[PDB]
Design a protein around this ligand. Sequence first.
Ligand SMILES: CCCn1nnc(NC(=O)c2ccco2)n1
Length: 165
Amino acid sequence: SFSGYLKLTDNVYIKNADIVEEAKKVKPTVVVNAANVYLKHGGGVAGALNKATNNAMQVESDDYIATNGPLKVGGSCVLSGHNLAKHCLHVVGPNVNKGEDIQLLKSAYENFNQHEVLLAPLLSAGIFGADPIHSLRVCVDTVRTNVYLAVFDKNLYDKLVSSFL
Ligand SMILES: CCCn1nnc(NC(=O)c2ccco2)n1
């Protein structure tokens, strides 16, 4: 199962890890992708997860969008986890760099409650432009299921742990 995580709360754990390497090692039931509404996995966590699937995640995602149209900011869809997990839960956190409502971050984390255990990144962090300290606080105050957070950046991981209330 998951190893080397620091316990933050009853149900939230955190580790300085590359979520792709973590997914290949654990092969969890659910890996969360930091998706956009179009499921265009170009960069950040999405670009890295997609590259690890040899673009199979993008091919599956384009078929999903062709059939269903875009997701909502704050929404999600369950697709295959390919070689990384049983399932990938593509969750759209607000992208502050695109002027999206930061208040939708709680709605985005509510998607995690439909899964008993997940390997996940901090939503809206990184290239999505939100403050990761705020993302972690919304995560702990919203998610009730078991969430194993992988934070790629060591310096950010240390700041998140040392400032956690
Ligand atoms: C790229 C280094 C790790 N990192 N990942 N997301 C962030 N972002 C921030 O620290 C930030 C954005 C708005 C306020 O603070 N840093």
